[PDB]
Design a binder for this molecule. Sequence first.
Ligand code: DTP
Ligand code: DAT
Ligand code: CDP
Ligand code: MG
Ligand code: MG
Lengths: 35, 734
Amino acid sequence: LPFQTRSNPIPWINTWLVSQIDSEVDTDDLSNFQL
Amino acid sequence: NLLVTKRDGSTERINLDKIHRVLDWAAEGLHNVSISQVELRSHIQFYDGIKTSDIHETIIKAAADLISRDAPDYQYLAARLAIFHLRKKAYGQFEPPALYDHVVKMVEMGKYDNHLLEDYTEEEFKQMDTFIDHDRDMTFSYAAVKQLEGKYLVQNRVTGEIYESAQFLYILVAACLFSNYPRETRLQYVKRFYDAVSTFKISLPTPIMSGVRTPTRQFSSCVLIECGDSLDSINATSSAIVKYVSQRAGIGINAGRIRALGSPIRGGEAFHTGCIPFYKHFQTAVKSCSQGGVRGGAATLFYPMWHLEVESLLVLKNNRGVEGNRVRHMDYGVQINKLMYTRLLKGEDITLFSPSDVPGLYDAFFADQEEFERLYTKYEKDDSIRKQRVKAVELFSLMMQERASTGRIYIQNVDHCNTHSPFDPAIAPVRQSNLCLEIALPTKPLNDVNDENGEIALCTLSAFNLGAINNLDELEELAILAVRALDALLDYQDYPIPAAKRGAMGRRTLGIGVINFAYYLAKHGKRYSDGSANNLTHKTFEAIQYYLLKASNELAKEQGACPWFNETTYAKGILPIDTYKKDLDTIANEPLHYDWEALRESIKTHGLRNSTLSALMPSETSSQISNATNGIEPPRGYVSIKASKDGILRQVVPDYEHLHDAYELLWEMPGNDGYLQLVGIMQKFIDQSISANTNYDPSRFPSGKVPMQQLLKDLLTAYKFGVKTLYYQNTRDG
Ligand SMILES: Nc1ncnc2c1ncn2[C@H]1C[C@H](O)[C@@H](COP(=O)(O)OP(=O)(O)OP(=O)(O)O)O1
Ligand SMILES: Nc1ncnc2c1ncn2[C@H]1C[C@H](O)[C@@H](COP(=O)(O)OP(=O)(O)O)O1
Ligand SMILES: Nc1ccn([C@@H]2O[C@H](COP(=O)(O)OP(=O)(O)O)[C@@H](O)[C@H]2O)c(=O)n1
Ligand SMILES: [Mg+2]
Ligand SMILES: [Mg+2]
């Protein structure tokens, strides 16, 4: 490679060069909860 | 052949090399950017006489829209163009003038407060100009500059004329805050505070950023007003809202005392029309004025869950129903205590009362949890008291249903706000919160606009940039600068409502939080959801609170504790590490690393200059200046889309190239338990509250609908770990 690495300075050129809520509650499950 | 219009009005031939050069300058040193791409994506259409300023604004938008994951350095290309544009608007050239020459011209125009020229000599202004490094404008991101030009830089809200640049804003915030310091140390504090905010060690709120140096002195972000059950109090509350909204403040209203619809007035001379007609009056008060010309006024209204009208108040934000029973443009916080949650867990009922029919129940609801249960159960037995029974499951379902739809129905755990607070509930209970549910301060209702007996709570804010510190011991110096700056601010500013000055001078309440917490976790290789940051959060927020209290304690030795320090639990020798909810020991075992016992004795002896110090605000706007992730929230994406005056803003996460794998994005989290655990750990040390969010992705649940079971379980999990408040509920749009 003779030149420094660089990103494509004209990236636009590549275009041309190819081709609600679940209401269920379980109180028993909630009471097994410790505040 | 064709002509352009220069900034001075003159015209000359079009020369595209001028556009090439300005773009070449802005892209110097940046990676993966293209001058060519910016010019072509500008779609700039030249007409004879085209304004050169319209040309420049067009290419700023073009470069701003190229901000992406593949080319993040456009955040700096667009900013440099925008900084350059703002220089010309304010100065007519790129190089800023001398600091003294600028202040002189601005005081004559009435854009600065004339006290700057009285408290500082020309030799001192020229000495502060050597502190300024104008190259620090080249460290902003594009989102940062758009917030500066849209909200913070002193400007004409009718003309659109910008008058200053970013470094003059910073240096004059430092000058004004320490303007009343002794000349032995004044310029030293001015330089260090300038360095702290211009290198993004400390974040300043919107009213401080946009206000401190202007003739109108109101810089407290949060105003908490309590409303009593009388027309004299409702008028006083309404007048205080109008005054503080017009001067940069966001409001928190406590209207839970107002009796229910149908209650007797004067023994039956009149029929009480209900809360909703008074809530509508509060809403037009908030919306009557702009927030200091910067943005619109907002407010959150608070009422207890057991209020008789709670089923009518919970549905005020949904868009179905008539205008008579809807108050949509205000947010609401439902106040809950342990007894309410217990009725839910046991599947029992909740009795609704009008606060006028239950003597002492309202005051006990906050101050005394045992006295509340005594009065509450007693009044349920009494059949002569007007009441209404609702199944606790149905009431909690109605609240969370409206919380999920609007996202603006908030929760405040009033028992947590009083068992783990810097205030004694017998003397100065906490009965409400603020707009964003991070402020918890005592209030007393007013009977007149100028009532000396009422108390309105003000809170001044700031934030530590967790992404700018390399050692937790750097917080010691930053806490000194932040606390000293905010405490000097309380004496510096004016107070439009006498009841508001009473609380501020009495308690001197501060609210200092954090920003860049998500970026902080990425640098340590931790995540929100898995609990890997629990011990790190404990060690981090211990240092924050310790160095904050130590800074306010040293200031109390120097200038005396706040007048009402005797009303704090700090005065009784009680620290937050004593009153935190003990279930936090089951999710973090990190031991305390700082000498809290030496501070406890020092606080007993010398007190605190401020009654409160720490509060984690969301910092939706202010955190964008340092390109930080806002508050404690995880970013929505590597490139986030945020709102602004001009339109959309793209914000890249800090250090995207090296840490894109380390971040845990908002919707990459399995649930809320991990985040809520971190919030609980933070709350162990935070004086006030935290703007804690809950987030839900419908696609993460069977049949694509979020279960009420999970909504309630996360709500109970928040209470289990001592979370005082719940802010936004974000529901994903996919
Ligand atoms: N004409 C009215 N229509 C609807 N509500 C009213 C009216 N007057 C007062 N209220 C409400 C506002 C307060 O929440 C509550 C008490 O009002 P207030 O100003 O204290 O009246 P008051 O002192 O003359 O009567 P009371 O003896 O009932 O307190 O009643
Ligand atoms: N003669 C010309 N023809 C076309 N564009 C020009 C121009 N002179 C300047 N510009 C562009 C370059 C900048 O991006 C933008 C504003 O530049 P500026 O230096 O602030 O304006 P001015 O040169 O009028 O003071 O206008
Ligand atoms: N749109 C807004 C945002 C914030 N605020 C106030 O600012 C406080 C903290 O919000 P924040 O820290 O997200 O706002 P900024 O300081 O980032 O502008 C809130 O408690 C409000 O009182 C407001 O009044 N209106
Ligand atoms: Mg020029
Ligand atoms: Mg009355």
